[PDB]
Write a protein that binds this ligand. Sequence first.
Ligand SMILES: [Zn+2]
Ligand SMILES: [Zn+2]
Ligand SMILES: [Zn+2]
Ligand SMILES: [Zn+2]
Ligand SMILES: [Zn+2]
Length: 113
Amino acid sequence: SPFQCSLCSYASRDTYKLKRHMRTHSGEKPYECYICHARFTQSGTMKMHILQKHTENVAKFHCPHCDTVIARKSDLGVHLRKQHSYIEQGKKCRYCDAVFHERYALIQHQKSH
DNA sequence: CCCTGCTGGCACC
DNA sequence: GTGCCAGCAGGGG
Ligand SMILES: [Zn+2]
Ligand SMILES: [Zn+2]
Ligand SMILES: [Zn+2]
Ligand SMILES: [Zn+2]
Ligand SMILES: [Zn+2]
């Protein structure tokens, strides 16, 4: 990684990667949504914007361990890691003595009180 | 450079 | 308290 950034410690082997990184410092947003004229730093981010808001018949992602539906697959990963990650020694209920080894089931029981 | 997944601020009303 | 959102960089090539 010979290409070194001038304003921070980021470095890369490709010129495209540094040109893209420089947008974080310059605040440049060269991509614009042709419907609401919203600006974005990267083109892939713009495609996700058009899909999630302006595109009809979108296929969201359903969680396998509960009934929550999520629009983005990456946000489903956050859900799985945050809500359904196993807890070796479960956390006690705030009200009663019930114990749960997954965060989602713990909150759903506390809301039942 | 397109595709992909991760990150943290922030509506939620 | 968490999904939504744009920001963001790595991988492959
Ligand atoms: Zn930099
Ligand atoms: Zn738009
Ligand atoms: Zn779930
Ligand atoms: Zn309880
Ligand atoms: Zn479980």
